[PDB]
Structures are given as C-alpha cells and as structure tokens.
Symmetry: C2
Subunit: 48 residues, 2 copies
C-alpha cells in the first residue's frame, strides 16, 4: 500500500516524462521513460 | 523547470524507495533505487 504509493508515484512520473518528451525530444528522456515503464511492471507484479 | 519538476519528483521517489527498502528488504527495490539514482544524475546534468 506503500507499494501502492510507489506505483501511483511511477504512474505520475511516466505521465509527465511522456509529456516532457512530447515537447523536448531529448533521448535521455525516452530512456528514463523506458525504466519507469519497467518500474511499473515490477511493482504491479509484486502486487496483484 | 519542467526539468526541475522532474528532479524533485525523482528526489521524492528515492526518499520513499529508500524507506520502502528500509523495512521490506526486497532486491527489486534496491534496483529501482539504482535507476532513480541515475535518473537524478542525468537531470541535474541537463540542468545546472
Ligand atoms: Mn521509477
Ligand atoms: Mn526515475
């Protein structure tokens, strides 16, 4: 639930990085996004 | 500044994952933390 606080936290970071990537096409950003996508898998795996 | 919103966002995620790792010693968590540490480098590099 602390694990649910974490997943929403990632879920927000991906919304904002996506958007960040929307206007500033910077490779470093697609990569951070890659990782946050994996963060999300891993937490939803540990949960439900 | 959108890049500053991102860094605080990571800076918080590392506070909470550290803490999350404090009580539930789960390897997946030290690894997420590893990545967030790198997220932070990369953004402070792009900034100041
Ligand atoms: Mn993450
Ligand atoms: Mn991150």
């Amino acid at each position: 639930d602390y694990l649910r606080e974490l997943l929403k936290l990632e879920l927000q970071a991906i919304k904002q990085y996506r958007e960040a990537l929307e206007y500033v096409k910077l490779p470093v950003l697609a990569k951070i996004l890659e990782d946050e996508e994996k963060h999300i898998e891993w937490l939803e795996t540990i949960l439900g």
